[PDB]
Amino acid sequence: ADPLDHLADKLFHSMGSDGVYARTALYESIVERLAALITSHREAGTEALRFPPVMSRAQLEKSGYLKSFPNLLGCVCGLHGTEREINAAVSRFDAGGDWTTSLSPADLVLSPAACYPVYPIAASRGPLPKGGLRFDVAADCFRREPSKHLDRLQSFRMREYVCIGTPDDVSDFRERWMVRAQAIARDLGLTFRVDYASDPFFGRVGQMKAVSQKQQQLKFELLIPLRSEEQPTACMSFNYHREHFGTTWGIQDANGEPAHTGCVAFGMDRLAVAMFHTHGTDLSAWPAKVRDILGL
Amino acid sequence: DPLDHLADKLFHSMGSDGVYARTALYESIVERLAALITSHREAGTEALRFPPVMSRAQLEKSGYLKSFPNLLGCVCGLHGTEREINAAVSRFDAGGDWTTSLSPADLVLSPAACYPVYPIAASRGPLPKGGLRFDVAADCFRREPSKHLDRLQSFRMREYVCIGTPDDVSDFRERWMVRAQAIARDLGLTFRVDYALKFELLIPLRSEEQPTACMSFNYHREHFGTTWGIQDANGEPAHTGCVAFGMDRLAVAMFHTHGTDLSAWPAKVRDILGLQ
Numbered sequence A: 001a002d003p004l005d006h007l008a009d010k011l012f013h014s015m016g017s018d019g020v021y022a023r024t025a026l027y028e029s030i031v032e033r034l035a036a037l038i039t040s041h042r043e044a045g046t047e048a049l050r051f052p053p054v055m056s057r058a059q060l061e062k063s064g065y066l067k068s069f070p071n072l073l074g075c076v077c078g079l080h081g082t083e084r085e086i087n088a089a090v091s092r093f094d095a096g097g098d099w100t101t102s103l104s105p106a107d108l109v110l111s112p113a114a115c116y117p118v119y120p121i122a123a124s125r126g127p128l129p130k131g132g133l134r135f136d137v138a139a140d141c142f143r144r145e146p147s148k149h150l151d152r153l154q155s156f157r158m159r160e161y162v163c164i165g166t167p168d169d170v171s172d173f174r175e176r177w178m179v180r181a182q183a184i185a186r187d188l189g190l191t192f193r194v195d196y197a198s199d200p201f202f203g204r205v206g207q208m209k210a211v212s213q214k215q216q217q218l219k220f221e222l223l224i225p226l227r228s229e230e231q232p233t234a235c236m237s238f239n240y241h242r243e244h245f246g247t248t249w250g251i252q253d254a255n256g257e258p259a260h261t262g263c264v265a266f267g268m269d270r271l272a273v274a275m276f277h278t279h280g281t282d283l284s285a286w287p288a289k290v291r292d293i294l295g296l
Numbered sequence B: 001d002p003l004d005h006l007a008d009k010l011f012h013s014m015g016s017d018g019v020y021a022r023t024a025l026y027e028s029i030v031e032r033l034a035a036l037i038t039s040h041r042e043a044g045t046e047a048l049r050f051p052p053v054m055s056r057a058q059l060e061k062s063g064y065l066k067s068f069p070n071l072l073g074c075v076c077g078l079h080g081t082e083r084e085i086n087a088a089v090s091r092f093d094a095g096g097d098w099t100t101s102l103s104p105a106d107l108v109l110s111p112a113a114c115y116p117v118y119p120i121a122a123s124r125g126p127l128p129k130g131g132l133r134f135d136v137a138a139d140c141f142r143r144e145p146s147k148h149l150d151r152l153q154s155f156r157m158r159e160y161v162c163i164g165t166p167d168d169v170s171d172f173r174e175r176w177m178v179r180a181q182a183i184a185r186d187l188g189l190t191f192r193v194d195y196a197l198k199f200e201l202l203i204p205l206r207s208e209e210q211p212t213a214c215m216s217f218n219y220h221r222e223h224f225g226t227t228w229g230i231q232d233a234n235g236e237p238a239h240t241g242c243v244a245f246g247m248d249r250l251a252v253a254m255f256h257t258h259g260t261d262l263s264a265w266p267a268k269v270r271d272i273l274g275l276q
């Protein structure tokens, strides 16, 4: 079986859906401590925003998400019809028929990544000041990838630091964080390597997109062996978007050029699972240095 | 609207009524409220934390679909072949509608934090004497757009849940109807208790004639006990009730009541919320 499976009893209860779990108090306390630790490394002048698990469908469309991962997107739908119509749908359900045929899309999707909503927000403020803007964002995200592996969820929490400004601003930020992220994983007693990577772009063209992204080194990941050293798990990523979002949303840097952006993302559930996989379910037995930095 | 002005310090627009980004000020208060509620948690209470989505089939069995079908948010996705999905996005490129290729997932956005806990308890067999107590939280969803700050589409719910005999649930209800009030009192909130059976603690937010329900008690009879086959220690279908706290409503209440400057909040309140 999967090396992570034995962890399930202590960390999760089933909710009748693969990748969707109830968190025990033990698991939760570790997520919160990881969150606090990440917060303690926040750079000065970084604005903290917290987003709900949903976001505007129009914004997600405009962001170009359907062009990259249409297969992962969770859209919100409801019964928007007339009372007669809605009653009809319910009656089918009562009669073992299919109520869902009356669903129609809402103006909302479940967020695929924590940073998305922040770009329209930064743009509404007009031109960027010299040195750009830094944001601290989090959200419960959704990706439509059902799986029984504990490191592959459908609903998971994502925490990010986001840099918006000049190519220089973003590169400095990304470099800084690739170093600081490795220092953090060390403090946590986790084994890792950092490597160039690519997003799981969809379809045939998606294979050309990934090769290109990898060669341009626009995405690094911090990888931790969970089920094996041969196929480690990405628990953080460092993403350079170049000018995509700046152009998309009309954000201009202090030079009046289309702003560049990048983000450093922490997979909270993946990090928590890595911690338990590495140090086990008995917190009293965790290494003293680890217990100390987490303030246990 | 009395609350509208609060937005300046609490929220940023996300392109959708009732869906706002939350500032550090606002979130710090939501967290402290969460902490305060935790401090009143009863012994022997199992704390579970639910994600924003849950089983569609569980939701169907809960009866929610019969009661508030218009408020449900169902999860839908593109579940077809690669060619079908590409076409959908191409239609979108050509000024058409890509959503016609959507089909329901096995999931919905949770309408109430406690719903998923009932099948969990049922799965463990007969309840012990005295029943079970749970502490649940979830980001919940209600498909009802509004510009009012106390009527969101996505909001945090916190709940203590009692599963047991009618005696268990009644003692639990009585206890919590009292604690809920004591809590609102310590928060320096002005409220009245009404019986909409269901108990509700309503706080004047827009007006005194139309106060907002910020905490409630729901008694479900043996509805979930019967649906999931939860059996009490005497072999009968279990009863359930829950005390529910609208975390985002409570936070808006606090800012409305005491203002957006935490330094000028009363010392009692700063004290109980670990601010002073």
Ligand SMILES: Nc1ncnc2c1ncn2[C@@H]1O[C@H](COP(=O)([O-])OC(=O)C[NH3+])[C@@H](O)[C@H]1O
Pocket: A113, A114, A115, A143, A145, A151, A152, A153, A154, A156, A158, A199, A234, A235, A236, A237, A239, A263, A265, A266, A267, A268, A269, A270, A271
């Ligand atoms: N299915 C899943 N289950 C659990 N965690 C996941 C996940 N998908 C992503 N994550 C976590 O979120 C992080 C960010 O994912 P990503 O790099 O694919 O998205 C982004 O581009 C963030 N802007 C990953 O490094 C991982 O730690």
Ligand SMILES: [Zn+2]
Pocket: A113, A114, A115, A116, A160, A239, A262, A263, A264, A265
């Ligand atoms: Zn990001």
Ligand SMILES: [Zn+2]
Pocket: B112, B113, B114, B115, B159, B218, B242, B243, B244
């Ligand atoms: Zn409930």
